[PDB]
């Protein structure tokens, strides 16, 4: 369905959210060089 | 360098900001039905 | 460890695949339009 | 248009491709130790 797209397209958001975190913890990471 | 570490893993931010501005308009584009 | 640099950015290319292959089936679908 | 899903559900293809080529280069730089 096109709201399958709206949770589907959230999962998306979430993910690429999780994407965000792991790449500030790459960033705090690599200022412990 | 680990300062590129930092630079490399700020453009992880970006791009995953860009994942959920993108997956945002997923939600909106398939909420129009 | 720079060995564990390794493994995380294997996990980063294998889930920036599986990415590519759920962002295929987004093509497929939005085909089936 | 669900063309429209299909083109940028293709650029998810390439930027999900451009994910595999720099966490590779993540991998390669993170292997010289």
Redesign the interface.
């Known amino acids: 369905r096109x709201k399958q797209x709206?949770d589907?397209x959230?999962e998306x958001?979430s993910?690429x959210?999780h994407x965000?975190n792991?790449x500030?913890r790459x960033?705090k990471?690599x200022?412990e060089?």
Do not use: P, S, T, V
């Open positions: 709206e589907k959230e958001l993910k959210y965000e792991e500030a960033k990471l200022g060089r």
